[PDB]
Amino acid sequence: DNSRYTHFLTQHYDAKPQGRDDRYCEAIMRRRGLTSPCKDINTFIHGNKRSIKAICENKNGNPHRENLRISKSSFQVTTCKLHGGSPWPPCQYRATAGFRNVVVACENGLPVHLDQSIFRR
Numbered sequence: 001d002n003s004r005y006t007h008f009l010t011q012h013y014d015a016k017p018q019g020r021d022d023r024y025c026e027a028i029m030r031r032r033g034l035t036s037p038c039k040d041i042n043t044f045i046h047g048n049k050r051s052i053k054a055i056c057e058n059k060n061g062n063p064h065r066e067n068l069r070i071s072k073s074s075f076q077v078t079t080c081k082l083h084g085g086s087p088w089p090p091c092q093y094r095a096t097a098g099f100r101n102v103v104v105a106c107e108n109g110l111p112v113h114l115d116q117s118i119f120r121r
Helices: 003-012 022-031 049-056
Strands: 041-045 061-064 068-071 075-083 092-100 103-107 110-114
Touching: 003 041, 003 103, 003 110, 022 075, 022 092, 049 061, 049 068, 049 103, 049 110, 061 103
Parallel strands: none
Antiparallel strands: 041 075, 061 068, 068 103, 075 092, 103 110
């Protein structure tokens, strides 16, 4: 029904990651099917699904710019940035762990888009 929310979880949610190093990013980017062609930058949010959904309402979200929402709470995140010249696999990634609020778009109370711009660096 809300398959864009499914896509969001697939691309942008990893509940309990462990060690969030380069080899983490390389494995998860492959497993979530984000490596043909290699996604240039991708952030996974960690922790509770409830907290993420809550960004779609006043509970854990504020309106942001045009059509976006921004979280009140800070999340543990890991950003996977592609390195090398090639857009095609194998896809080597550098991992950047973080802890901050996130920017999403919501539809019908569910996140369907992560704004990756805030993780570029």
